[PDB]
Design an enzyme around this catalytic site. Structure first.
Site, mmCIF file in Angstrom:
data_model
loop_
_atom_site.group_PDB
_atom_site.id
_atom_site.type_symbol
_atom_site.label_atom_id
_atom_site.label_comp_id
_atom_site.label_asym_id
_atom_site.label_seq_id
_atom_site.Cartn_x
_atom_site.Cartn_y
_atom_site.Cartn_z
ATOM 1 N N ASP A 134 35.104 14.299 62.820
ATOM 2 C CA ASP A 134 35.461 15.702 62.863
ATOM 3 C C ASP A 134 36.365 16.041 61.735
ATOM 4 O O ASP A 134 37.432 15.468 61.547
ATOM 5 C CB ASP A 134 36.102 16.118 64.172
ATOM 6 C CG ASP A 134 36.461 17.553 64.245
ATOM 7 O OD1 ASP A 134 35.689 18.436 63.786
ATOM 8 O OD2 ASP A 134 37.538 17.880 64.880
ATOM 9 N N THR B 197 34.640 27.969 53.826
ATOM 10 C CA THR B 197 35.851 28.717 53.487
ATOM 11 C C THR B 197 36.895 27.754 52.915
ATOM 12 O O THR B 197 36.727 26.551 53.063
ATOM 13 C CB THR B 197 36.473 29.493 54.640
ATOM 14 O OG1 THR B 197 37.109 28.563 55.518
ATOM 15 C CG2 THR B 197 35.446 30.449 55.378
ATOM 16 N N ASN C 115 28.019 22.302 62.229
ATOM 17 C CA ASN C 115 29.290 22.992 62.264
ATOM 18 C C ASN C 115 30.113 22.593 63.463
ATOM 19 O O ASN C 115 29.529 22.297 64.550
ATOM 20 C CB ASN C 115 28.982 24.509 62.267
ATOM 21 C CG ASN C 115 30.215 25.340 62.521
ATOM 22 O OD1 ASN C 115 30.481 25.751 63.678
ATOM 23 N ND2 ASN C 115 31.053 25.532 61.499
ATOM 24 N N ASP C 116 31.426 22.582 63.339
ATOM 25 C CA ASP C 116 32.328 22.114 64.415
ATOM 26 C C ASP C 116 32.306 22.953 65.677
ATOM 27 O O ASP C 116 32.372 22.420 66.799
ATOM 28 C CB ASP C 116 33.760 21.903 63.873
ATOM 29 C CG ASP C 116 34.435 23.154 63.314
ATOM 30 O OD1 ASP C 116 33.715 24.099 62.966
ATOM 31 O OD2 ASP C 116 35.688 23.113 63.200
ATOM 32 N N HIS D 283 35.060 34.837 62.503
ATOM 33 C CA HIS D 283 34.957 35.978 61.556
ATOM 34 C C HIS D 283 34.289 37.177 62.184
ATOM 35 O O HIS D 283 33.778 38.053 61.474
ATOM 36 C CB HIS D 283 34.333 35.498 60.238
ATOM 37 C CG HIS D 283 35.028 34.261 59.759
ATOM 38 N ND1 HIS D 283 36.321 34.273 59.240
ATOM 39 C CD2 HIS D 283 34.682 32.955 59.931
ATOM 40 C CE1 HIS D 283 36.683 32.988 59.073
ATOM 41 N NE2 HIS D 283 35.727 32.177 59.511
ATOM 42 N N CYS E 222 42.229 37.226 56.104
ATOM 43 C CA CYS E 222 41.652 35.982 56.547
ATOM 44 C C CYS E 222 41.397 35.020 55.381
ATOM 45 O O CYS E 222 41.087 35.461 54.259
ATOM 46 C CB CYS E 222 40.276 36.214 57.249
ATOM 47 S SG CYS E 222 39.613 34.794 58.113
HETATM 48 C C1 LIG Z 1 35.536 25.375 56.352
HETATM 49 C C2 LIG Z 1 34.998 26.605 57.111
HETATM 50 O O1 LIG Z 1 34.201 27.400 56.582
HETATM 51 N N1 LIG Z 1 35.503 26.757 58.322
HETATM 52 C C3 LIG Z 1 35.252 27.950 59.189
HETATM 53 C C4 LIG Z 1 34.260 27.715 60.293
HETATM 54 O O2 LIG Z 1 32.996 27.208 59.778
HETATM 55 C C5 LIG Z 1 34.810 26.761 61.309
HETATM 56 O O3 LIG Z 1 33.889 26.620 62.412
HETATM 57 C C6 LIG Z 1 36.145 27.221 61.832
HETATM 58 C C7 LIG Z 1 36.875 26.297 62.750
HETATM 59 O O4 LIG Z 1 37.143 25.026 62.196
HETATM 60 O O5 LIG Z 1 37.054 27.437 60.721
HETATM 61 C C8 LIG Z 1 36.590 28.418 59.773
HETATM 62 O O6 LIG Z 1 36.418 29.656 60.373
HETATM 63 CA CA LIG Z 2 29.793 28.041 64.527
HETATM 64 ZN ZN LIG Z 3 37.455 35.726 58.315
#
Ligand SMILES: CC(=O)N[C@H]1[C@@H](O)[C@H](O)[C@@H](CO)O[C@@H]1O
Ligand SMILES: [Ca+2]
Ligand SMILES: [Zn+2]
Ligand SMILES: CC(=O)N[C@H]1[C@@H](O)[C@H](O)[C@@H](CO)O[C@@H]1O
Ligand SMILES: [Ca+2]
Ligand SMILES: [Cl-]
Ligand SMILES: [Cl-]
Ligand SMILES: [Zn+2]
Lengths: 309, 309
Positions: free
Chosen positions: B9, B85, B112-113, B165, B175
């Site tokens: 992770d 991001t 994605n996490d 977002h 942000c």
């Molecule tokens: C590196 C990145 O783009 N992270 C995003 C999103 O994809 C992640 O799910 C989130 C939580 O870690 O952080 C940010 O909102």
């Molecule tokens: Ca997601």
């Molecule tokens: Zn944002």
């Protein structure tokens, strides 16, 4: 007779009943105001549909069924309007299928008007063949419809795609749904009318060379002709709608967003602007278009009959 | 050896690698800071995974594969991080599958996490057996995951469920994604830290009886102990998150919303409050719960291996 549907659209202002061909031609459309009370409303719906059914025989159209587009949360499997915002008063726990099918001797389908708009875009419009897309229909209120893996998302309680009630402010304007900061509260027809009637109340709408009840179209004209209060109002309205679109992109990530209603042409540029200023890079390839359908909700109501009868 | 996965992770602060059993027990977890540069990051990921793989033999665990949870937009079919991001710098167009599978001689899955969190809740948590549900994972950032008809929604460009977002203001706080008014910008760990460090900068955080780098947990403690600037900040943060939830309800209409991360316990009451004050009647039956999983993202990464190997 030619293969046709009866279509009904119950809107925030008008009740419309149409004979619609298999090909998506509106053969004939009747328009009345949507009555404010249940008893009057149900009686007028039946009246209109009986008349339209009789005219269809004269026009050599064979009616296969009735499809109903309505504001509100709807259980389509049962043909029941579950709950409505005050845009349609006295429109809670209403079984539409039973009275209409008993009176007309036809099968009856019912769905939310935004959902119907999506169905029209999938059958006749720019959503044809797309695994996924979302539509926002601007009218009195703002309706939504979501197509994912080719099919509508109705949600766990028939409340998916209530996209007019995406919220884009911690405060904001009051919404008729009882919340505040909803995109409907910023950008609907009813919102812009209310803001045009405000200005015109304080002799601050009319300019340059308009003649002249104030409405959306007058606010847009004042702004085109240089009215700065009206330009400000419209920018804020368009920004709010654009942010609702941003929320959709970051939630569903559709390939296509279809804006419909007469205000769609007026907001599309600002919506695109807000996406480009604010949304994630991975959604920038989203196509945002104005619908090429005259009346998505009514065509969508017809599409339920045409596809499922 | 016992049937296990390697799970990684990659978070906004820490890089974690774990040996996870078939039953969702974390056998051993390694933690380091997530390096700020690509070269360092990729090298540490490999290092950690080689070590964990070696320890797994000693612990009599049989590793079936590697699953990777990462911030950013991800193509799971290809095992590529598309775009991130600035929470993870130098993390664009990165093929993770190739170096990890070449080094470890294992199959590799990546998502994605927030998507991983959803997968954990579906396998081990309160999402088990549910046709539909959404999760928001609060950490450094805010992650999302959407399960509809039992399966993840990834979107047309792998950007669905970027729920951090969701935007709930026309203006707001900036942000890190480059927008403003995102729920992440209000309510993430990073947001609350930043607001705790603000207060503490002007000697306005500490009160009553705390000892004492300021963080989220100190702001929450100041507020519990009567700090009114901190209570205000937390209310605004919780309201914003609640409104993001409202947008989810009106979009997807899930049966269940699972809040996870250490801040979930702190926001659940206000989130419920905002739903009850503002959302449509037809979504009021939504269940909103705090996750019962220690580490959804890491468990979710393991779940990709365990389910698909
Ligand atoms: C590196 C990145 O783009 N992270 C995003 C999103 O994809 C992640 O799910 C989130 C939580 O870690 O952080 C940010 O909102
Ligand atoms: Ca997601
Ligand atoms: Zn944002
Ligand atoms: C009566 C009612 O509840 N109408 C809602 C919504 O269901 C409609 O789709 C929308 C557009 O007509 O208006 C309103 O937002
Ligand atoms: Ca709808
Ligand atoms: Cl009223
Ligand atoms: Cl940076
Ligand atoms: Zn509303």
């Amino acid at each position: 007779g030619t293969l046709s549907a009866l279509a009904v659209d119950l809107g925030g202002t008008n009740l419309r009943v149409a004979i619609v061909s298999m090909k998506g031609e509106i053969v004939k459309k009747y328009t009345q105001f949507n009555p404010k009370t249940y008893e009057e409303r149900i009686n007028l719906i039946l009246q209109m549909c009986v008349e339209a059914a009789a005219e269809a025989v004269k026009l050599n159209c064979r009616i296969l069924g009735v499809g109903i587009s309505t504001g509100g949360r709807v259980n389509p499997r049962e043909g029941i309007v579950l709950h409505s915002t005050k845009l349609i008063q006295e429109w809670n726990s209403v079984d539409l299928r039973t009275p209409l099918s008993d009176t007309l001797h036809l099968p009856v389908w019912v769905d939310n008007d935004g959902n119907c708009a999506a169905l029209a875009e999938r059958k006749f419009g720019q959503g044809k063949g797309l695994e996924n897309f979302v539509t926002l229909i601007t009218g009195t209120g703002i309706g939504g419809g979501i197509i994912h893996q080719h099919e509508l998302i109705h949600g766990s309680s028939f409340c998916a795609a209530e996209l007019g009630h995406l919220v884009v402010s911690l405060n904001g304007p009051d919404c008729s749904c009882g919340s505040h900061g909803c995109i409907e509260a910023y950008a609907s027809g009813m919102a812009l009318q209310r803001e045009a009637k405000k200005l015109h109340d304080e002799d601050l709408l009319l300019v340059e060379g308009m003649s002249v009840a104030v409405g959306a179209l007058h606010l847009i004209q004042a702004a085109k002709l240089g009215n700065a209060k009206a330009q400000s109002i419209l920018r804020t309205a368009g920004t709010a709608l654009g942010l609702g679109v941003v929320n959709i992109l970051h939630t569903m990530n559709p390939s296509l967003v279809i804006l419909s209603g007469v205000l769609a042409s007026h907001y599309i540029h600002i919506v695109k602007d807000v996406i480009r200023q604010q949304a994630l890079s991975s959604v920038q390839d989203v196509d945002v278009v104005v619908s090429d359908l005259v009346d998505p909700a009514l065509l969508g109501a017809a599409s339920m009959v045409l596809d499922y009868t």
